Design a protein around this ligand. Structure first.
Ligand code: NA
Lengths: 128, 128
């Protein structure tokens, strides 16, 4: 079948040394974020909730530098296949920042990443 | 409420109130970013390689609150159709933060936001 395409640009906070303001008034550098920062920040926020998507499959795209990743999204495991840039950092539950290509994420952002793998649970924040 | 969305498709809400570390070591509040903060070169030449994507078309989606955006991506203009929640913030060359629904982006990200338009050239802040 035909995957959905992800946004073709990356947001700026992935740049190492950027500082996030969490819904606990706390400030952390992006490279220092932990899983509990998201969970606690979501818990406190009246607007945001935590959700998650599990990596089911990673395949090469026909475009070089792009992966096709199959996700199982949220508690009913809705199946979504998306084209994503290999440098895109996902935040993996109990791991931290992870990408299809850590070396490229290092080149672009200086953000240390683990290699994204099948079974990884990626954290997201969505509106209520 | 809207269709299943992979992690990189979601607006990055938690970048609200972030401080971005620019390639040169400067710091900028995310709402204060300018096009020049994206450009390394202190004097743009026709040398200047930018990675960008240009908006070609914007349509309503069957799903409410979601827009479908066609992009021409990169130097070779790959055609990519991207479905996103309308508040998704793009940084536009010569314009700044823009979206398919400025009002909602401003309230959710606490920044000034323009309407995304056909012709808008969308960029990412990176080292590159
Ligand atoms: Na919450």
């Amino acid at each position: 079948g035909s995957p959905a395409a992800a946004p073709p640009t990356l947001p700026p906070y992935f740049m190492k040394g950027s500082i996030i303001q969490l819904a606990n008034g706390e400030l952390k550098k992006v490279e220092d974020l932990k899983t509990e920062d998201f969970i606690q920040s979501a818990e406190i926020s009246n607007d945001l909730k935590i959700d998650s998507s599990t990596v089911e499959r990673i395949e090469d795209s026909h475009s070089p530098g792009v992966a096709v990743i199959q996700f199982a999204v949220g508690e009913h495991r809705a199946q979504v296949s998306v084209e994503v840039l290999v440098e895109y950092p996902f935040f993996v539950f109990g791991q931290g920042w992870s990408s299809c290509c850590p070396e490229r994420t290092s080149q672009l952002f200086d953000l240390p990443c683990s290699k994204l793998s099948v079974g990884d649970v990626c954290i997201s924040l969505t509106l209520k």
